[model samples]
Target: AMITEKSAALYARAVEVMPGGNSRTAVYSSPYPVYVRSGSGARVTDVDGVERIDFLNNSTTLIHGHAHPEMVEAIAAAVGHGTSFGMPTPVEVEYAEALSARNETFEHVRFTSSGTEAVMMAVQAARAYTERPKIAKIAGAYHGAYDAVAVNNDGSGNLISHAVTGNPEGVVANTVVIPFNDPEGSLEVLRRHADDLACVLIDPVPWRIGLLPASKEWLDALREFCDASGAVLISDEVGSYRVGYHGAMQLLGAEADITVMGKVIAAGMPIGAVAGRRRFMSVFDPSKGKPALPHSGSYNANPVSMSSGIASLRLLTPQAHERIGQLGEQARGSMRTALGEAGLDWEVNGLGSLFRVVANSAPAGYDSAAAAMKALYWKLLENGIHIGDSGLGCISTPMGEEEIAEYAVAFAKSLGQVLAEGRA
Candidate 1:
């Protein structure tokens, strides 16, 4: 009893209308998901009046933490004028310029309403530029709901589709699935599809693939392959953008022809962008005439998201990234210590501000991950700590050693209970 009556009642009402009692599948729980009432700084208050340090941070989107005063003021000021418009706004251009300054490769940029749209646009640009029919992606890597990147996304060695009706002929059939972190295996697959591949999609630090950083060798091999084949290399950093100042490629010693961004860049706002060299990005440019792939959205680059993005990116200076990274290291160390003291052999994997706890064998498939998730997720929630169901955790700028120590204590207690009952 942590007073889950209100949340249970809410879920009971929710399932009557919405399937699974929620829209976002990631946040759904077995009994009932906690209903968040409000959030401020690094904490969220649930409907039950329980408060917790928010390590999940809206799935690592809230880099500056919830309701940062500056971002609030910026968003409030933006809404005063208007939310969105059919016409372009000055703030969008300013936001684009600010984003381009972060990476020299991002010479041009286009906005979308979500990360899925960003990846879709990036793939479309690559196809339009190269006139290719196929795409390649790391197996087990998630790019979003797009069909092209949804093949082999479960790390199951079999092709799977996120769609209920299954993918079209050109989706899973046209996609070349490559093994992650295995250069030779991946290279062989790429070479087989080299002539037809429009782009190579990858996440430098893929969360679904056990949150492991891509091996530099594998990335370099892909980069060379794409360069020789004239296939666009699109780095989907929708979730990993927070890994570094310039992005995950900066930390991984790699580069890409296009970069897809979301999450932290918008300061918890709904936004996404596809950015890259002007030549490849020109597929969407209609300055001279009709573009190859014409793209538009009702809320694309709306002033509210733009203003919030501008404020958020300003807060994520290099120094802020360094501090958050330090916090990540401390968190990983503390978790390692807790598991070690309990004489449990588990693994903690991550880079920058992201971390994931996994079994000693480092299982990457859904079955094991699902089992472990059930064991640890609710226990953490019950202990007044909020983390992703996959055991993924991220640090926010507002958190410090005090919050980390609290997490460690809760984790130790939870692990003890889970192991004593052989739940994990």
Candidate 2:
């Protein structure tokens, strides 16, 4: 069993201290969560000494994979220096400069504690700058856990979906939800709400749920609409920043007034950033008497995070980026072949390093996805592979085409078991 005896014992004690034996509900399991002792490169060893090839890259944040030697050295040096001080550091500036230089739109940048905070600050920045009450976002597109943009992206309707309908706490009244890939329909909605719209938040590739890539035409439409309406264009690339060169928008040449980045860009640390144009970001400018939107966080630009980020981003060179993309495609191709051999009606969908092995045999719904992926994720664990229950995982720079072939062997076996059961 993937759930080790020691892990089960530890988790039983954890529930006494915490709400559900873990901090994040995403890692929860009915039996017990697998407790990890450590990770190195493309593999993780649980407390039970079980080793598994890690495919999720720690939810797509570990671009170079776990405990990269260079990054480890830099982080160790940073920790020895000092953890945090109530002042700015050079590493922070260095990291931001490196990221900003890659994209023209990231003229100004601000660091935040997490991707959620980054989205919150970016949305506030848009609202404050535009002096508009409403913000538009894609349906079924999740930006973060914040209230303003907490609208569900699960709405597959052809038109606008009410964010407040399903959510019990309800979103802000001004929050608007736009349909995915419907450029014309989205344009009409934006025009109707143009006078009130402040920003159109989007994810170029939300690989986990909606494996739909952002179309150039759709992006062009949003850019044009925002320009005409004077509304902000925000690309919430918390999970997909690494998929593109520096910024995910670089893939399609899409222009954004502001871009929120986290995950891969922050290296291995738990950090996020809100980057944007100079003019729009001027709201936080203290040089002008009394800043318009004075934003601050306790752990903003800590030396440890910055030092780690600098090391992480520097390792991803042009060649490394291309190689990672090729690895992603190879993994998909291998998985597709395995699914064919098993006679399973499933499609692997994603771009760059991210992917979702979705089963089409089941009737489409939340249960179908959750059940299928949950079983698959658990089954893979038995085969010494670790991916999330959502059937969502990603490759890292440390992995090669060889790791993909290994996964294909496990994929065929796992699907065979699932097929032998009623799931097929």
Candidate 3:
């Protein structure tokens, strides 16, 4: 009901021309998505002139939040030099070097337009290096829209079931899905398909499904299995990059054969990258025999995106991560305290700045998540707080302990109002 008349009208008009009123499915919400005019720091003012804290942060990409002066300047400088060319530039080299220096897992890196294409190329490179046809990914994990790893949200809600057929036209046959946080099960699956498996792709923190961080023990076991089985281990660090400067491998202590990165990497620009050992990455070398895998894109290494990426990576210093950690702790602590004080049974899962809240009383599975998400969404919106529709939350650099405390108060009030309405 808090959605503005203008936003509703915009949605109505959008639906007539575009399917689902938006190009991105994740942006859709019940009733309609807020039509935002502009965002500054941690807040967004919708077209209706209502301001709300942006805990979602554009799906965890805006680490510095909206309209940071430094990023604005960087984009302006890039635009002053012109947008694109059909060839490489110094900006691309600088961005790639910055990433390599920050993360040891990436000996060499290549840029792409988006995470979807980055993951696609990473999977293809893995397949080419190992000469295998199948890929193993965590069940319920989202790598991108690419065919090799697009399967998601298995109707059962169990994070391990991927029995549903192909998500698109020709993908299921080449993808091997496994349960998350289950070291033993994952190892078993890897062993069972060792011959056909090329790589095991995973998000160290499965932010899409439950915001569950993979246990160090599980990662260690997977690494060991990959080493013994000749299977490449790829860590999809796109979302988790916001968690740290060197990425999740620094926090998890797990080294992967390849790392797919995006989001915070380029400071909100349309940039994606794949980094790994030089030997495996060399498969893309144009001079290599049969060129293992053909790859090219008009905007693959656009200077504008590269300039933004270099600027963003430079901004993610150790101090920045320390601040992010503190904010994450504050948010998680406040939420837990609020729920406990209300005598509500809930579990909050998160790492660094990514977090999620789940209703403990709800039955386990997708239906429960869906129901809890529905209740939480409308309640928070009515209270003038904007969180991701899927009950997930992310903290940005502009947020602090005070902001988190405010959100906790709003959360408590919103839950109370929902409960009162249910009783009526």
Candidate 4:
């Protein structure tokens, strides 16, 4: 539990410039988060000289784990030639082609610097296609730092049923939020706002809402509703890529009119994409009258990121998905067994490689999830492991049965130690 001198010094300097010594809230931990020096397959070494299995996997972005040799070589090669250019590069086209070939829904694709930008563009495209102003997003789903999808559960935990505001002003008014797993509620909201609705965005497997996977019926219904109402369905696949090589849509046997992708596709680099069928995607074409949506970014498809993304996607074959599924099952099963053995009340929920562990006693709401997450995070850190503090965890391609077993043991010990201290 002791802080390393290097980490202490780094954090001391970081606090001077960045608030809380980190740009991301999720990265912050009590008593200061551990500063990592380097990472290998399935493991990260902290400044304190502790090596722990990396369950967070760079917030589910590092599918092949850190310092993947192929990615390293590709980026290194690209860096030698040049980094960025205002004009498009062949690498960008290569990356786009690779992605376009993977899914049937995406006939064309556009790249961005981050998932936030990708989601923003997707929403803009939807609005352009439908000529509507209102957007509907799933509550408790994190779709990057965009305003339209930023709203969360109100203090009361009701999503669409009640008005839950967001951090950025005017988000709640712009977006209509719906609860997860409530196909009926979602349809009701969509029907109510069918006239003004431009798009319905959702993370097929909502990790924030206890890693609840959207039912196929829900996805089908949403797609149908959008078709009938002239609304676009945008699937936010940033975090859900762990579920399959193609994405959540492929796994669910459903399709989105437009899909936003990030994370694993970029292999830890800042890259995102918005792709869809030719009809809706053509809105970005400038040659056909006024551009429906104007999109431009300096580093939208930098050569380095593009090369890294292409390499990462190349590694994700059908066999890779099978392996990820096997590891995911092992990790979830082990966690369940450990929780039962420790006499803890818990439920594990998810599909494919992503899962969330929720304490059974925790009340049903965002506040309850927050409370449980706070205690669980501290305990896991004390045990030399790092889990996504927001009630989420994802298995990477590098993690096999052995690593999953180790995590289970560590989780049990951490829970037991924390419980004992609480009783004391």
Candidate 5:
């Protein structure tokens, strides 16, 4: 409380205007949000000048970490030419070609200002091609606010336990919720609505629920189900684009009919991309008079983002990708060691570059779980490491032995506090 005095004062002024004192629900807290002053390569300082090892990375967008020299140079070069142009730029084409070289699934691509838009576009293209009305998704997996992907979690030990939450306009009515990792149930739900299902919207790694990477068999089951039923398989990499050298789908041996990517691909710029095989993505082809799937966005593939993304992807070489995956494994290993030392029977779950801490024992329901999360989060924040509510961690190229060691120490102390205080 004393350390965040400046943030407290700012929040007092902020609440008079903004609802709940912030725009994003994830950043909200009882006191206020910590206003970050600046960030640079694996660390962020709050307005109070409190520096912490930054694993959050703008919710895992900064694979190279803040103010990276190459990205800064690229953005500076492009911004001088102006931010966005109504007409297409060469940077856009170059960026698309680079990303296309990364994954074999997408021969063509479309850009959006945000992940939600890309995901919505992908689903629309699937619907247009398959002429189906319903979409199936793993319950509790976040693909952004659009109704077709919006569903709620019950705060259970297993988040994607198949609870359905409807959106305000009843657009969720068109969604078929599937249980994560349950082949029998998934096949039942999706197969029951196979004829009406246009697409299966899934996350190779669903972080919001907890960093639950679906099994190879689980992903294969979905792919097989989609293939058998003619449903377009959509892999939402909006949150986990950096999980593999190529993509998380490739890491998991999952085949995607349509792939949605964002986050690290843009290097902190606001951007989203939908890509797939030429046959499906040709829906956006304008050469054929009126295209089957007409698409346009004011800031699609804007120059600044395109240039920065190109630089970002360039830096994500095979070495950087493998190194980050190594770091995630090392971080999880450290967490396991520390938790054992602290006498906490916790399970750390994740794959590739993501890891999450889950307690062996779970609370009864939502309220208790929320309280537990808050307590642990506050304890960690007070100690100078913040993971927001999700408790998920990601590794970037800039994160190495030093950052991993610091995070391990912080993890031990914070969770030790939680246990000592009886919060967990």
Candidate 6:
């Protein structure tokens, strides 16, 4: 039943060149990773010629889905002129303007090559603006791979080398850990580090942590704490931006001094952006001598990405947002019914177009659902459906009620098999 002969052969040669036959660790799987041959609309064909509905959408980067016509046309047009340039392009300015129009708080914006760089720059901007050495982040909330915000990622409250990969001990020491959705507990932790805190970073709809959203009260408390402590509040919306027109912060009526954006904003291009209020963003401004922080990159605000981003935003109208959201609701509802038919007590959680398959009611966190998640992942793949390895899925613009129903059918079959094996 191993239908990955071509992929296994490719991975064999790939490992001889690339480490572990992988460039992105996120996509790597045991046995071997499935090699994508092509993608169009809502489906992707793997190396072995197996096609599956692409609910993963490149980890929620493809809002419009794979090879969208407008996005393709925009990239094609931009490519003829040039790709990257040492000088600024008109598209970058136009893209910045487009993002600024999303929210009144986005007075200025800066570009980066990836979400990691966007978050790093945001943290740097905060430190430079507030002159503080420490930052606070919600436990289990991922803010890219930046060292300052990567500590306590498993809700372990261990900032030392135990839960860390390559972060220095000093970097871990400066990170303040706080509980998610607990305004009181979070404030207690934030207060202890108030003097040295530069910023509090968070993801409004955290995907890894069961796709649970932060409470309004928790965000209000953090905003107040940052205001009183003179520290900045940074919202990492790299993934959650797809949930709304302006972004998750706007949708939730919360506010952040600095916002990290990526994924869908660039229409599947490799890009990231940091938008903020004027006072905080000024740290990267070089108009008056050397600014507090110097940021320069070869591909920053490249014209191709800018043009693609513009095209994406143009297509992402309120109607499109509503359409995808409706599809998400249908999918979640159908999935719940499917799980019930499979005799499982699991649940689905998330907002807008995103969803996570939780294994139980009142789940504590990822650990409690990891087993069911892993089993369901492979079963869904076997049933010709693709989602993130962590049970994360999203509805793209190309998806409709039909696709949602397709997902439900697959989920029913997959869950049945998972239950038969006593996996969930």
- Provide TM-scores for the models: 0.95, 0.94, 0.93, 0.93, 0.93, 0.95
Q: List where candidate 1 sits over 4 angstroms from the true fold.
A: 157-165, 361-369
Please state the error at residue 145 of candidate 6 in Å.
Answer: 1.9
TM-score, cand. 5 vs. native? 0.93
Task: For candidate 4, write residues 259-363 as lDDT tens digits.
Answer: 999989978888999989988998898787878788889998899999999999888878987888788888888888877887767888878777788766653
Deviating ranges (above 4 Å) for candidate 5: 153-170, 362-370
Q: Mind giving the per-residue lDDT tens digits that candidate 3 earns over 1-424?
A: 6748989988999999999789888888766887889999888898888888888888888888888788889988998997889878989888888989977889999999998999999999999999988888887788767756876533133544354454654567677677788888888778889998889898888776677778898999989988987888888988886666678876778888899999988868898999998988988988746687888998888988988888788778888778888888888888888778766688788888888886666433324645755677778877878887666788877888777877988888876775665555
Compared with the true structure, model 1 gives a TM-score of 0.95
| Tens-place lDDT digits, model 2, residues 240-342 | 7877886778786787899999888866887898899998899889886998899877889998889888887789888888888888888889888887876
Better of 1 and 3 by TM-score: 1
What range of 10 consecutive residues in model 2 has the weakest lDDT sum?
A: 153-162
Q: What is the C-alpha lDDT of each candidate?
A: 0.86, 0.82, 0.81, 0.81, 0.81, 0.86
Model 3 alpha-carbon drift over 4 Å, by segment: 1-3, 152-170, 287-290, 362-369
RMSD of 4: 2.8
Q: Model 1, 413: alpha-carbon shift in Å? A: 1.4
Model 4, TM vs. native: 0.93
Give per-residue CA lDDT, model 5, range 1-424, as digits (tens).
4388889988988889899778887678776778889988888888998988777788888889889989999999999999999889999999999989988997889889989899999999999888789988877677777766765533332323233454454565677778788888788888789889999988888876667777887888898888889899999998876777778888877779999999989879999999999877877898979988899989999999999889999998888888888999999899889878876566788886777877555333325545665677777778777675656777877888988888877777887777667743
**TM-score head-to-head 5 vs 6, winner:** 6
What TM-score does prediction 2 earn? Answer: 0.94
- Model 4 misplaced regions, further than 4 Å: 153-157, 160-171, 362-373
Q: Which window of ten consecutive residues has the lowest lDDT sum in model 5? A: 154-163
The Cα error of candidate 3 at residue 393, in Å, is: 1.2
